[PDB]
């Protein structure tokens, strides 16, 4: 396939893949993504940093051939860099190794085992283990490896301060534009917020630790393994610092499910009370919405509301999927215990709301109240929802 | 709307609604359903047994008017019977009451409160609280009520047209089917019995012990031999009542087939490869297999197959120390359904792939135990399974299948 | 239900409904919408302009009661204004009329018939047929009607507030009521989608109605545009300007590529065409019919200078999914905007083919200028993919030349 | 992967793939399918008939190895048979050829070109072009090729016909035979397969049947082993079904398809159904907002009438109808020898026109359009009675049509 490489610095090219058609990746919705791979041309050696998903190498090979042609060099890779084991960045490693068998493969110690487990043809490949720190001179260009998850590492092109961070600072976006400044800021920052919410939230304590143990001024560009390349590294570093420390807006994310609309009516009434205080509201209906967009909004919300009816003594089963996700994400690790209210309608003994409150506490939320009612809410019951929402909104505005 | 009533007995008509277009109802998938309502013409009183979902009364009114015209009676209802509070059978009660305000509403004590909570316009309506074995004479036709608490709600009851042995069982014995055909014998048996199995699995499973109790009470009173027809609130009318009674007795007592239901989720296909390998080992023993991929399948079909499976396999990869979140939904459903209530602890295996510390499979095993399953083993592997690892899955599947065949 | 009204001017409130949960409306995808209704407090009469979708009136009543309370007035509506017949704006009319039976209902002659057909309980309601340029004095506040079929605009003369119903609306559901309170990119993209899906076939009418209003001088009197969905425009020229651009066919150096596939060959061709287009610095939007839908596709076609459509051949015809998009494009009539967007038809086949020829023919019927067709046998070779790249490159050169 | 082969006859095994997880294939919905491949052990040569979809060969290799072990033979394929070029049956051909490069590949002349186009590694492979009624001996077992790029392979001694797609069904069960699953499931899947894939070939099927009957080869068929689903131990059951579908044998049934934006067309569709039902005629109702083309055409296949409704949007019918119309234009239901009856309907709010477009497209698709009914906004009680009256008349015409 004929595909053009994109020059990002003198002798440095983006030779990645545009996955236009993917809509879902590990239960994270998207409108396509990119598998960013980079080609570094040293005076003596040519290095390929990461690659792409199995079966999507056609664009990558085309761009590698195009970059080599533009540089007046032969179609050849001398050094292979594998910052991560995950198949979206290592899927083409067996074919890259088969084509250039003498090119050493730079990766972490644990990554050798993971790579061979994914691709048995790599047994006996020339792996060059990176233990904490390792450097390679390509002739006028130096690549320094920083072992960071154990399977991962960062690659720094030292002379120009270009950090190949792999997943970190990534965003799932698929555009013809390669840089951060070429797309609308809102699209970039919202995609960055979604990527942090779904993939970095449980690592928030480490993000804070690493940042303090690195203060960063030398980083001129952040080239991640997904989406846009940051020509303004401080913009994403700053965003990460805010998310990791729990800097939120006067906003509440309301999530609910319903069978006959009573819990839905309660959710809308809570929102009215919150809005009367000028606090922002994001409303999610589990029958139509999904977990990745919900957690993106929870990330900068000072409060979270969860409602569901009772069905055979348990809350409606859809809450189970979000609860399991929140249990893995650990939002309390951002250093903030977001406020929460549990609610729902019931027709007999109830119990769904009590289960919700208990699970919200386990997920790191500060549960302030619970509100369970019988069948259809009356006007007075809806006013109670409004009053509870209003009081919560007052508390949200009072939080640091 | 012009809609014809269907005569089911002398002076008895089906005046129900065909919900052709509904595809999902309280997280239960279907290809339409019916809200079965019945009109009983006595010499003195006309009784309406149940009604329909809010906003779907047009077909119902058309059929009621057609039945009244056929019987040379005035368009009038004298008795309203509300077997259940649930809006798919009570949704038209406010408009039925507004039209005929003198007609008493027969229901249970708990039902009065539930109905008024759903429809405030019913405050002050003529409710008539009824208890088991109490009766009303319509003139040559008798309606006998039987409280069916927690079948499937506490405010539930059954109405029996005693002279013809027609049991208006509301949700019990129902099936979510929407056909032009009204009777059990008019459609393929496999479609009828599979829809009946799905309805039991999703709505009657936690009530299994209560089903066995209500049955022994109905037998001791000599009422079972008197039932000539079962007219439920959804699907087909049973002209063979023993067929569905027998099916319910089997599901409530845990009568299963030499069958395994395998459910899994995957991000990179490794857990999927494991699931396929377990299936191969099970099949080598002649045991049946039903395979569900949580990325495309849903909870109602899964539990339909669990109902007559002696074993259940659940697999998912590890994501941030937890199993893939889609399992959370199925686990929460299984926690409510309580398959142990059938009198049987189905066998189970937990499995999955991981890339670091793992832990997903341990969570799965723990949750399966909480759901009443007898967890026999756990199998967690690193990334892509090797040929040897897939043979281990096949061997584990083979051993489980041997145990399945050994169970009663 | 308790719900707060939002004051938009002195004695003027938004008493609308936030439909948080709707995800699809007449085959148009969205993340909720609003049914904007307005309450105008005159010294003598209180007027309600439009209402909401059947079954969603709880928020509306709450906001009306809240606005009445804030104004120190009784819970009373004296005048009902029905700008449009469509149920998303008239659904609560039977209950508004039942509550205030003496309040006249202001609407066009054709609207009366349309409203009674929707709601039989309105037979005998006090309808007040309005002619164009007819006014009502509420006491210090004047409402002027402009018949634009059963649809009309209401102008609150004193403050220049134009209640435009669907025109200038956007399907957005936020706590924020004004255009300036949300990111411009979100507002303008939602406005582009609304124009693409609902105003495109009316482009010639948009141009004529604008040309007259400018020479007449009405446009300079508009200080605010309060539509029936989404954000209220505090900057009316921003949306008027956007409409003028869409109506005249002002496009970007961009190509929208739409395709479907059974075995991946047409998909490979589509990606190769995109590579050739990109080599010329031209923008590309890629849509796969197995996962994507018509409302987002047409939003991108609106500002694209070219459109590519590809599908394999199945029983002498193109893959059936194209039929849906073609039927939509036939009704939207993009050719009318004043420009004929460039187009290429493509696909893979395994026997006699013919799908690509059908595609080219339908693209021509939809008003596109079809430059070429490319049909190949089964899996594309490296040379065939380079041909796609070359065709996409040449098309991109032509796009930049327009 | 370890996977067991299934013995179908002495020295004949099913070595296919169970695609448990597939839910959609070329716009045809399903709950998994199978890619049936067969291993024939002769005294001298071992033949593999068809294979599987690319990337799904693990089960296939496991079943081939298991069959060879059970036969006390070495893991070896001496003959490769390729009945079709389609990747769901030829996807593993490059790896089968790489493993056994000396094994000739039997296929049609056109098949060679198609296979090499799909898999460039096959350039120079030992292809053996086969023409009609040509045979090969495996040692006590004979394989006869029947040209249909597609073809049929007949194991002559036991009368086993490897029909490839013909007589196939998209079903994925542990059970391999027709008699081991409920008849309704089998016959409904067979009806869906005919509707979506054989309908435009109806006249050719009738020709190819009369030719197989004249030769007296039909009475020789003891088993039909297709490339998808169940193996027919009762070949006449599926042959009979095919004869009925190809000749237009239908039930007193009507398929109603509609789309709506505000529910008015939906109310009309329900009212037409009420009138049809008052005549004892069967009804299948499809809402295009939730349903899809493959199930719709399955029911059209044995319906004597078809109703299509949609509102008017910018002078055109709701766009979802365009997809079904394009599908029906390819399927050519008039090829069954019957012009099914049809009514076009819809609601509108201005000038209308959607119903006229519907009627025109239904005629193009081979339907006999009897009437059109377009109304303004919400139907009144009287308008719903008119739908009911029209449905009743159509139903009377349906009952009057004979086979
Ligand atoms: C299948 C089913 C199971 C139910 N189980 C219970 C239960 O265990 N306890 C209870 O109090 N109510 C139960 N109910 C009643 C619901 O909780 C009641 O309808 C509730 O108000 C629904 O709220 P929603 O309108 O938000 O769905 C059940 C209802 C259904 C349909
Ligand atoms: C978002 C994400 C989170 C993960 N979290 C964990 C984890 O917490 N522990 C672990 O051992 N592996 C983790 N992994 C690695 C996966 O478990 C590994 O890829 C596994 O083999 C996936 O199985 P599958 O192929 O069935 O999806 C994670 C992978 C991803 C993509
Ligand atoms: C159900 C079906 C019907 C087909 N009909 C035709 C046809 O009428 N004419 C033709 O030339 N090819 C036909 N083909 C072959 C396809 O056009 C061929 O596989 C094409 O390359 C598919 O393109 P894709 O890979 O983009 O799906 C058909 C294929 C299938 C599966
Ligand atoms: C986007 C849109 C476009 C429309 N275009 C037309 C039209 O061109 N001609 C017409 O008579 N009515 C038109 N209408 C009105 C609809 O046809 C009318 O609401 C119809 O009764 C809807 O039927 P349904 O309730 O079955 O969707 C349109 C409505 C919408 C929302
Ligand atoms: Cl490999
Ligand atoms: Cl309170
Ligand atoms: Cl009420
Ligand atoms: Cl218990
Ligand atoms: Cl009304
Ligand atoms: Cl060329
Ligand atoms: Cl190949
Ligand atoms: Cl023809
Ligand atoms: Fe119920
Ligand atoms: Fe095929
Ligand atoms: Tb990644
Ligand atoms: Tb009580
Ligand atoms: Tb029910
Ligand atoms: Tb509107
Ligand atoms: Tb040729
Ligand atoms: Tb096939
Ligand atoms: Tb016109």
């Amino acid at each position: 396939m004929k595909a053009d490489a994109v020059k990002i610095a003198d002798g440095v090219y983006w030779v990645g893949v545009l996955d236009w058609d993917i809509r879902m990746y590990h239960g994270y919705t998207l409108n396509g993504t990119t598998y960013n791979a980079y080609l570094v041309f040293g005076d003596d050696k040519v290095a390929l940093i990461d690659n792409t998903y199995p079966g999507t190498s056609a664009q990558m090979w085309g761009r590698i051939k195009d970059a080599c042609e533009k540089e007046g060099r032969e179609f050849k890779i001398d050094v292979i860099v594998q910052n991560h084991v995950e198949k979206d960045h290592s899927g083409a490693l067996p074919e890259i190794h088969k084509k250039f068998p003498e090119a050493p493969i730079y990766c972490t110690e644990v990554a050798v085992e993971g790579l061979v487990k994914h691709f048995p043809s790599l047994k006996g490949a020339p792996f060059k283990v990176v233990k904490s720190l390792e450097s390679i001179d390509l002739g006028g260009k130096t690549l320094t490896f920083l072992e960071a998850w154990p399977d991962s590492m960062f690659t720094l092109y030292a002379e120009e301060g270009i950090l190949f961070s792999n997943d970190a600072f990534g965003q799932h976006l698929c555009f013809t534009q390669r840089f951060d400044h070429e797309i609308p800021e809102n699209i970039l920052m919202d995609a960055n917020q979604k990527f942090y919410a779904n993939l970095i939230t449980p690592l928030s304590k480490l993000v804070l630790k690493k940042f303090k143990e690195v203060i960063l001024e030398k980083i001129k560009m952040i080239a991640p393994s997904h989406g846009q390349i940051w020509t303004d590294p401080m913009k994403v570093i700053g965003a990460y610092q805010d998310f990791a420390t729990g800097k939120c807006k006067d906003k509440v994310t309301i999530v609910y499910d319903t069978m006959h609309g009573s819990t839905q009516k309660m959710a809308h009434a809570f929102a009215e009370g919150i809005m009367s205080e000028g606090v922002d509201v994001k409303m999610y209906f589990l029958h139509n919405d999904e977990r990745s967009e919900i957690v993106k909004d929870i990330l900068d919300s000072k409060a979270f509301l969860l409602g569901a009816p009772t069905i055979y003594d348990e809350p409606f089963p859809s809450v189970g999927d979000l609860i399991y996700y929140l249990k893995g994400l650990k939002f309390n690790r951002t250093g903030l215990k977001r406020l929460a209210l549990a609610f729902g309608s019931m027709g007999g003994n109830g119990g769904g709301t009590k289960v919700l409150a208990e699970k919200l506490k386990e997920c790191g939320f500060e549960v302030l109240d619970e509100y369970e009612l019988y069948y259809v809410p009356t006007e007075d019951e809806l006013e109670k929802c409004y009053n509870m929402g209003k009081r919560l909104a007052v508390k949200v505005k009072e939080m640091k």
Side-chain angles (χ1 to χ4, degrees), chain A:
Chain A
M1 186 195 194
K2 196 182 198 298
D4 299 14
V6 180
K7 193 162 156 171
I8 66 169
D10 208 299
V12 187
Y13 296 84
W14 167 87
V15 287
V17 172
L18 305 168
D19 194 343
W20 301 105
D21 315 312
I22 190 164
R23 296 292 171 265
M24 178 90 73
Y25 185 43
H26 54 67
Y28 184 124
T29 60
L30 24 94
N31 194 45
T33 192
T34 68
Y35 307 116
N36 304 327
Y38 306 91
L39 202 55
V40 184
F41 288 85
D43 297 322
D44 315 307
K45 297 174 183 64
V46 178
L48 178 69
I49 302 158
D50 290 330
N51 47 90
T52 186
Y53 196 84
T56 70
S57 73
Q59 283 180 39
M60 187 200 68
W61 286 121
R63 302 190 210 281
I64 290 167
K65 290 176 197 189
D66 180 66
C68 286
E69 205 179 324
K70 282 166 169 170
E71 287 291 310
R73 306 282 279 262
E74 261 291 6
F75 170 44
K76 193 189 186 348
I77 293 158
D78 304 290
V79 172
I80 299 158
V81 177
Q82 197 63 68
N83 300 313
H84 201 185
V85 167
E86 240 182 359
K87 68 190 218 177
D88 45 313
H89 310 309
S90 72
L93 186 54
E95 55 188 286
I96 295 152
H97 168 65
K98 194 179 158 191
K99 186 76 184 197
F100 308 106
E102 288 164 323
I105 305 155
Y106 290 84
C107 64
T108 67
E109 184 159 31
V110 63
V112 174
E113 195 166 338
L115 285 165
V116 173
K117 196 70 162 55
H118 275 90
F119 325 109
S121 63
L122 297 179
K123 281 172 202 210
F127 292 107
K128 258 65 167 197
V129 167
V130 176
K131 248 285 239 219
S132 316
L133 201 148
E134 190 83 356
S135 262
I136 182 172
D137 183 17
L138 303 177
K141 295 189 179 64
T142 307
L143 293 183
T144 303
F145 313 105
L146 306 141
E147 172 176 42
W149 256 48
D151 285 299
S152 54
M153 74 175 40
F154 289 164
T155 299
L156 174 79
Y157 164 26
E159 291 82 357
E160 289 297 324
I162 300 174
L163 181 77
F164 300 100
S165 58
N166 190 262
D167 277 344
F169 314 109
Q171 342 85 48
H172 289 296
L173 291 171
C174 186
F175 293 110
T176 63
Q177 295 85 11
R178 302 269 48 83
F179 301 99
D180 59 345
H181 65 85
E182 304 178 316
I183 68 157
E185 195 232 61
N186 170 268
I187 289 168
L188 176 67
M189 299 320 278
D190 187 70
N192 181 59
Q193 186 173 321
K194 190 177 178 174
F195 200 97
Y196 190 106
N198 289 274
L199 300 155
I200 319 292
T201 307
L203 323 167
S204 295
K205 229 85 96 170
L206 294 350
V207 173
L208 274 195
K209 258 252 272 184
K210 286 185 181 190
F211 280 164
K212 285 175 190 183
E213 293 175 358
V214 87
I215 295 159
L216 197 123
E217 277 290 284
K218 291 185 177 74
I219 311 306
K220 302 291 192 282
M221 195 180 91
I222 296 166
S225 61
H226 295 290
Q228 316 311 108
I229 290 154
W230 303 90
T231 61
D232 186 1
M234 285 314 302
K235 187 161 206 150
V236 68
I237 282 153
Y240 266 53
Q241 290 245 198
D242 291 349
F243 298 146
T245 58
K247 211 203 226 169
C248 300
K249 297 170 172 158
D250 287 338
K251 171 189 170 167
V252 179
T253 298
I254 303 171
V255 175
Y256 74 89
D257 213 342
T258 197
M259 298 180 287
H260 306 300
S262 303
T263 304
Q264 179 168 65
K265 285 166 195 165
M266 291 177 76
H268 293 190
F270 278 111
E272 291 305 325
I274 295 161
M275 293 184 284
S276 78
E277 283 297 318
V279 172
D280 205 5
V281 169
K282 290 294 158 182
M283 185 85 57
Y284 289 97
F285 182 20
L286 287 169
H287 245 83
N288 304 318
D289 303 327
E290 52 75 57
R291 71 179 86 81
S292 73
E293 280 298 318
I294 292 168
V295 307
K296 173 195 82 177
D297 277 315
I298 290 174
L299 187 58
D300 65 345
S301 285
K302 283 181 185 183
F304 171 50
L305 266 60
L306 186 61
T310 301
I311 176 168
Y312 298 124
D313 311 318
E314 299 296 333
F316 195 79
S318 60
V319 299
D321 177 313
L322 181 61
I323 290 163
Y324 271 47
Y325 203 43
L326 292 167
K327 203 168 187 324
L329 294 175
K330 303 166 204 86
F331 273 95
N332 48 289
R333 288 192 175 176
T334 58
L336 171 71
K337 290 255 299 222
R338 287 153 180 82
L339 306 181
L341 296 180
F343 66 100
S345 177
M346 54 84 184
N349 290 320
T353 301
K354 187 179 172 168
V355 175
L356 291 182
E358 175 206 333
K359 302 304 173 175
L360 284 164
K361 284 171 194 130
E362 289 179 24
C363 293
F365 294 92
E366 187 176 336
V367 192
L368 306 175
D369 221 331
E370 296 171 42
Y371 189 30
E372 194 173 74
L373 52 77
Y374 188 53
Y375 291 130
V376 185
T378 62
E379 208 88 303
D380 287 351
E381 289 171 332
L382 291 173
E383 193 172 341
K384 177 166 157 64
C385 291
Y386 174 106
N387 292 342
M388 284 178 72
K390 189 172 184 67
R391 283 187 243 118
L392 170 88
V394 167
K395 279 201 163 284
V396 159
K397 293 191 289 182
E398 286 174 341
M399 292 168 77
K400 174 234 69 62

